[PDB]
Each structure stands twice: as C-alpha cells, then as structure tokens.
Design an enzyme around this catalytic site. Structure first.
Site, PDB file in Angstrom:
ATOM      1  CG  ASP A  60       6.397  10.155   1.217  1.00  0.00           C
ATOM      2  OD1 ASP A  60       7.252   9.600   0.503  1.00  0.00           O
ATOM      3  OD2 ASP A  60       6.121   9.752   2.366  1.00  0.00           O
ATOM      4  CD  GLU A  68       4.786   1.066   3.763  1.00  0.00           C
ATOM      5  OE1 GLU A  68       4.822   2.179   3.172  1.00  0.00           O
ATOM      6  OE2 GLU A  68       5.808   0.496   4.196  1.00  0.00           O
ATOM      7  CE1 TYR A  94       9.207   2.313   2.387  1.00  0.00           C
ATOM      8  CE2 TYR A  94       7.294   2.023   0.986  1.00  0.00           C
ATOM      9  CZ  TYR A  94       7.859   2.481   2.149  1.00  0.00           C
ATOM     10  OH  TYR A  94       7.054   3.107   3.077  1.00  0.00           O
TER      11      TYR A  94
END
Ligand code: OPX
Length: 658
Positions: free
Chosen positions: A232, A503, A615
C-alpha cells in the site's frame, strides 16, 4: 525439438509411479525442460509431482523435485550433498484447483538452463520465478541419480512427499526452451488476465480490482497499478483502466485514469526475501483504492480514488488535518513553500496561489493538473527511478524533467501530507480520462479525508442520484451527488467501530432501498439499510453463514437483474474463512419481499478452500453472465507479497453458482 520422453494419464493416488526405465537413460546434457499438465483438486499438504533422486542409503539429500503445497504454492528442490548444493525455489499462489467444480488442468513448464545458469518456472502461462545462480546444478547431474518418479520422491527407498492428483501429460526435453517457445505451449486456463506484467502500465503488480457494467454494454475495470511491489501507499501506484466490448472475452490495452510522474513507471522485480521484502518506495506520490459509477443523465463515467502526496500513506497521513483552509464557508487547498515551516498559502479560484500571511496573490498559479506555474511558465522537477543494484532500495534522480506537481517531494509548493479523495470523468466510456479534481473536505477543516471504498459507486435506478461509500473512524460516510458529480454532500452512518477498515459496497434492493455490505473487525460481514435513497441509515446487522478473519476483507456485491428461484437475488463476493484470505465464494441471497431480509441460499466455491482469494470485483455482464476480477492470493499474508499476475478474471453463469 521433440521430447525425449512423453507420457500421460497417470493417476497419483498416494502411490508413486516409477518411470526410471523410460526416462533415466534419455536424459543427456546439462539443460532440461519439463512440461507437465496436471490436476490436483484435493492435494495433500505438501506433495511432489515429479522427482529425480538418488534412492540409495546415505544419499537422502540428492534429488530434484517439482513440488506443490495445498496453499497453491509451486516450487522445486535441487540438491546434491557431495556438491554442497541445496537449492529451493518457489512461489506461493501459483496454481488453480477447481473451476465450476471441475478439476483444473494446470500447465507447468520448468526450464533448467545451464548456459545462463538459470531456473525458470511457468504455471498457466505465467512466469512465477526465474532464479540465476553462481554454481549451476543440472537436474540430472545430481550424484547417483537412479530413480525417476511421479507422485513422490524416492529417498533411501521410501516414498516421500506422496501426492494426490493426476498428471495428464508430461514431457521432457534435453534443451532449455526459449521464453518464445514456452509461449506457444497450449494452455487450459480457467481464467484470463486484464492487467498483467509487461502491459502498457509497466507496473509489475496489481491490487484492488473493480468492475462496472456500462449502459452501452461495455464493461469497465479499474485497478491499482502498483510499482513498488504490492505494498500500500506510501509507494508508487497509478490507477489504470481497461474495458471489454464483448462481454469480457477480450480487454483493451490499459490506459491511466490517474497518474503521477514524479517517479518513473518501472517494471521492477521486488525482493521477496525476509531482509528486503518490506522495502517501500518512500518519496513518490500515489493513488490508491478506486471506485467507478456511471451517470445516466450526463452519460459520463466517474472514477474516484484516494490521493497520497509524496511519501504518504495511511500509516503516516496527518489524521487531524484535511489539508484545506475554511474561508467564508468555502474550502481551499493549503500549500507550504520551500523553506517555510508553516503552510502560508492557499489555492483559490482559477488556481491562483494566495499568501495567507500577506493576504495577497502571488505570481504562482496551479493549473488543472495540479502543476505549478510561475507567471504562466511551467515549472519542472527531475524525475526519480528506483533500483536494488546496491543491495538495498535506492531512489534517485534520472535526468528527466517532468511538470512540477504540488503532490511531489521536489515541488516548490507542497500540499499537506495527508490523504485526499480525487475524482476524474470520462466522456467516452473509458477511452480517455480527464485530469482529476480533489473533492472537498466533508468532516471539517481538522479531519483527514475519509477513505474511498474500492469497487463500485451506486447509481440509483429511479433518479439521478450517485453515491460513493467511504469510511473513517466511527462511521461510513456516503458521498452523494444529484448533479452528475459536480457537487457532493455527505450522509454519515455510525458504526460500532473505532478505526475499522470498513470497506463497504452497496446494492439497490428496490427503488429507494439501499443495502450496504461492509467489512468489520468481528469476523462477520455487516450490513445496514437506507430506505430514502441514502439520506438516513439503519443500525448495523451481521451476516451469519460467512466467516472472515479478525482483520477482514473487502466484500463486493451486486443486485442481479433476473429472478432466481422466483425471487430477487443479491450476490456477494468474499473469502469465506476465519484463518486467512482464502476460500473464495460467491454467495447468492434471495430477498424476502415481506421484510427485505435475505436468505443466503447458495455458496459457490471459486476454487479450493485453501487457495487464495482476497479483494474482488463482481459485475453482471450484459448477457447476464457474471464476471469476477479478484486477487487470487492472500493479500494479507507477509509470505505472499509481490506476486505478479495473481489478479485474474473469470466468467460464470448463474447455473454454475446454484
Ligand atoms: O444496475 S446498475 O447499477 O446500473 C449496474 C448495471 N446493471 C446492468 C443491467 C443489465 C444487465 C447488466 C447489468 C449494476 C451495477 O453492478 C453496475 O454494474 C451497474
């Protein structure tokens, strides 16, 4: 060349097959290629598919093997005790197990090249490792080799690493076949790649897939094109897009939706060893976590993503500063000039740089691209490139000048080091993107930006309303626009969490009714409901029947257009596991029109429970198939960092799921 050995339909049922008589006397020279088509839909924890060994007493460490783990990891061992060589090369998350419930034929190509002293492994058309050594060990030059074995390695007369699976085809060549020859070997892949190493993005890594079906029937995808390994931000990451006009069969060469140029777009093999794997590009600006929606009224496509100034990510963003100054009831981006300890500047109307201590405009302006002009003249900075030539990560100037951007390390004027949300639009359904604009703060002058929920925004069916979910400490913060994204307001929805990575993705169950599914810290996916098109939100409930880890994973969600079992259906995509990011599932829920409750009726296993799934993006394709673009690896595990070509795309029909 033709093979020196070729055989097929070998069943590996925890009992090895000896092929010594057929193969051993054919092996010659120091270079070899192994081509193996195999299935393993119920593998043992650790199993060898192929072995060449010295089976004699006292030489247990003289063998070559191709092995796999029930995690999906593939590797080789090349060992010779007399030579003092014990090579082990491998990569996690390299295999498929099952697709549509059918065992997948994986195609493995291992090249042992004595000339370049290099061992290279491909699986399913993807290079998973390429390792060069100073002292090369030819796989059949191991001292005293006397067994060739399928489904185990014979060590001191006993079967080690017993396998369960099948080898439908195996061939060996007395040559290191070229990368070009490899590319001609036929594949039986259950997946496709949309973004991949060596494509137009020049990023070696990808994370955070999205998918969205446009009114024209074009299917659009966005993704983090991640340059500095899979880390990230802080890093170098751009947002890339690709579209399909044929229901996902083929995809366009990617373009950028959002990019910075302070660092070069470099295809880099990020180190995976325990000393260097946490190396992180530390002076680049980046984008991270994108989301897409289509606006019916204007016909525009809108893409949002988080924006990080140079050297900034979640870990070190200033949590008590929006990066804007409030004035009269308007918000203006703050700037710090070279040498100042303070942020004494703002960006005003038309991009005019205004001095706050002198209350007086400057000769500097900020253009649309957030680039710095002095009296109309474009200022520049020198670009950086990265390398590990020294033995550690180096970031250094490369001689090339690029426009000076307020998000850069080397800029004369610099933004607050915190996170922002930006928006860009396309008027041609993803063929090109506008320059982005920063969204205003929504939670005050002294609150960092909220974090965008990756995936889809929501276009309400009965109106012009557009909604993008975002999260922050203690709430979901929905961003709402009724004017094609020109202006936004927030709708806050409390959740019982401090500092969750909440999320969230939304579905419209029926006109005006939105259910949002979101990641939590409880091991269960949560949801909440709005019945006034996002104005107000219910308390939080939790889904039984799906498990997540304590830290959780993004969940994607759609409302399917067709009835299933006579009912309205919602489909969720998520790992189903309380251990790690694995066990990917699509879970089909049928809506009870009495109370809008959802009965989660079908769970479809994307691949093995032990194989990676993180994801994900799901969309209903125009032909009513389902497209899934997902991270096929454990993106949390510190053992599966920096893997290439693990974000993959599959096509499913509803009957496959049920
Ligand atoms: O109903 S929409 O919200 O506009 C959307 C697309 N619906 C079509 C309906 C016709 C079949 C294909 C999908 C679903 C979301 O997941 C986005 O893909 C956009």
């Amino acid at each position: 060349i033709s093979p020196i050995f070729q055989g097929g339909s070998y069943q590996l049922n925890n009992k090895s097959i000896d092929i010594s008589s057929l193969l051993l006397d054919k092996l010659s020279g120091e270079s070899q290629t192994v081509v193996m088509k195999f299935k393993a839909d119920k593998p043992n924890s650790l199993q060898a598919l192929f072995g060449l060994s010295n089976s004699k007493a006292g030489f247990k460490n003289n063998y070559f093997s191709i092995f796999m783990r029930d995690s999906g990891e593939i590797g080789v061992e090349i060992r010779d005790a007399q030579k003092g060589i014990n090579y082990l090369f491998s990569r996690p998350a390299s295999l498929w197990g099952k697709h549509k419930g059918q065992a997948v034929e994986n195609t493995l190509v291992f090249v042992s090249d004595s000339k370049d002293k290099t061992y290279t492994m491909y699986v399913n058309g993807i290079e998973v490792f390429s390792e060069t050594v100073d002292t090369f060990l030819p796989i059949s030059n191991i001292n005293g080799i006397d067994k060739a074995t399928l489904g185990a390695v014979n060590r001191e007369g006993k079967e080690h690493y017993l396998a369960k699976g099948s080898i439908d085809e195996i061939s060996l060549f007395n040559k290191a076949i070229s990368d070009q020859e490899v590319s001609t070997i036929p594949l039986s892949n259950p997946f496709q790649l949309i973004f991949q190493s060596g494509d137009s993005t020049q990023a070696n890594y990808f994370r955070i897939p999205t998918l969205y079906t446009l009114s024209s029937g074009r299917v659009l995808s966005s993704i983090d094109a991640r340059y500095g390994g899979t880390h990230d931000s802080k890093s170098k990451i751009n947002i890339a897009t690709s579209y399909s006009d044929d229901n996902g069969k083929t995809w366009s060469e990617p373009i950028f939706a959002m990019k910075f140029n302070d660092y070069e777009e470099q295809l880099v093999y990020w180190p995976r060893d325990n000393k260097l794997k946490n190396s992180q590009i530390s002076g680049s600006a980046s984008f991270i976590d994108s989301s897409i929606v289509e606006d019916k009224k204007s016909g525009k496509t809108i893409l949002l993503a988080d924006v990080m100034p140079a050297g900034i990510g979640n870990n070190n963003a200033n949590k008590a500063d929006s990066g804007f100054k409030e004035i009269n009831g308007h918000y203006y981006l703050k700037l710090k000039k070279n040498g100042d300890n303070d942020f004494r500047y703002t960006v005003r109307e038309n991009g005019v740089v205004y001095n706050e201590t002198t209350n007086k405009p400057t000769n500097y302006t900020i253009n649309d691209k957030y680039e710095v002009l002095e009296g109309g003249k474009s200022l520049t900075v020198e670009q950086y490139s990265v390398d590990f030539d020294s033995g550690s990560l180096r970031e250094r100037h490369n001689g090339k000048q690029v426009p000076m951007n307020v998000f850069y390390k080397d800029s004369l004027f610099k933004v607050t080091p915190t996170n922002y949300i930006a928006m860009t639009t396309s008027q041609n359904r993803g063929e090109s993107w506008e320059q982005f604009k920063l969204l205003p703060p929504f939670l005050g002058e002294k609150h960092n930006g909220t974090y965008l929920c990756p995936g889809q925004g929501l276009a309400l069916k009965s109106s012009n309303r557009l909604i993008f979910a975002t999260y922050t400490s203690g709430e979901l913060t929905y961003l709402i626009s009724d004017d094609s994204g020109q202006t936004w307001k927030k709708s806050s929805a409390s959740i019982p969490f401090k500092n969750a990575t909440a999320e969230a993705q939304m579905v419209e169950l029926r006109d005006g009714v939105i259910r949002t599914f979101f990641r939590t810290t409880t091991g269960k996916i949560a949801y909440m409901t709005s019945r006034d098109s996002g104005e107000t939100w219910s308390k939080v409930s939790y889904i039984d029947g799906i498990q997540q880890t304590s830290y959780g994973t993004q969940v994607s969600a759609i409302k399917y257009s067709q009835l299933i079992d006579g009912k309205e259906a919602v489909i969720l995509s998520t790992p189903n596991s309380r251990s790690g990011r694995k066990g990917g599932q699509l879970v089909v829920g049928l809506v009870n029109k009495e109370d809008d409750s959802i009965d989660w009726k079908y769970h479809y296993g994307i691949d093995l429970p032990s194989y990676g799934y993180a994801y994900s993006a799901i969309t209903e394709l125009p032909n009513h198939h389902i497209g899934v673009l997902f991270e096929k690896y454990d993106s949390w595990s510190r053992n599966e960092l920096h893997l290439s070509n693990v974000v993959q795309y599959i096509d499913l029909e509803i009957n496959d799921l049920t």
